[PDB]
DNA sequence: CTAATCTAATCTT
DNA sequence: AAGATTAGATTAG
C-alpha cells in the first residue's frame, strides 16, 4: 500500500552512491529519514544492486 | 523489434490454457515452435496473466 | 490493445 | 546477500 515519493527515491540514490551496502545501522536511519519500514528499504537496495551494477 | 503474427498468437494461446505458468523449459521449447526469443515469450505470458485470466 | 519496461516483493540456496 | 521470478504500474506502439 505504498508508492515511493521522488524525494525518498532521491534520498536513497544518494545513500546508494555513497556506499551500496548499508549495514542495518545506515538502513534504520534511512528508514527514519524517509518514513519507510526498514524491511522495505533493504528490498530497495537489493533490487538496485541487481539492476544497476 | 516486435509484431507477433496472428499465427504465433494462435499457438501460444493454445499452449496458454495448456500451461499457465511455463517453466524455463516449456518456454524454451515454445521459442523454437514460434521463432521468438524465450525472453519475449515470458513477457507475453506475464502480460497476459495480468490482462486475461480464465 | 499489446509489447516492453521498471518497480516491489517473495523464495531459494 | 544474489539470483530468479512473480505481480503491478506504467510507458509506448
Author numbering:
A (entry chain C): 9 to 61
B (entry chain D): 9 to 62
Sentences from the paper on this structure:
DUX4, a member of homeobox protein family, is exclusively found in placental mammals. Compared to other homeobox proteins, DUX4 contains two adjacent HD1 and HD2 domain, connected by a short linker of 15 residues. Very recently, using next-generation sequencing technologies, a novel B-ALL oncogenic driver DUX4/IGH, derived from the insertion of chromosome fragments containing DUX4 gene into the IGH locus, has been reported in ~7% of B-ALL patients. In order to investigate how DUX4/DUX4 fusions recognize DNA, we have determined the crystal structures of Apo-DUX4HD2 and DNADRE-bound complex at the resolutions of 1.5 and 2.6 Å, respectively.
In the asymmetric unit (ASU), it contains two HD2 molecules and a DNA duplex of TAATCTAAT (DRE) sequence. The HD2-DNA complex structure reveals a clamp-like DNA-binding mechanism, in which the N-terminal R95RKR98 loop and the α3 helix interact with the TAAT site in the minor and major grooves, respectively. In the minor groove, the N-terminal R95RKR98 loop adopts an extended configuration making loosen interaction with the DNA backbone. Upon DNA binding, Arg96/Lys97 or Arg95/Lys97 are utilized to make direct contract with the phosphate groups of DNA backbone in the minor groove. In the major groove, the α3 helix forms direct hydrogen bonds with DNA. Compared with the Apo-DUX4HD2 structure, the guanidinium head group of Arg137 in the DNA-bound complex shifts 2.9 Å upward to form two direct hydrogen bonds with the phosphate groups in the DNA backbone. Inside the DNA major groove lie the residues Gln143, Asn144, and Arg148, termed QNR motif. The side-chains of these residues insert deep into the major groove reading the “barcode” of T1A2A3T4. The carboxamide head group of Asn144 rotates 30° anti-clockwise to make two direct hydrogen bonds with the A2 nucleotide. In a concerted fashion, the guanidinium head group of Arg148 swings 5.3 Å into the major groove to form hydrogen bonds with the A3 site.
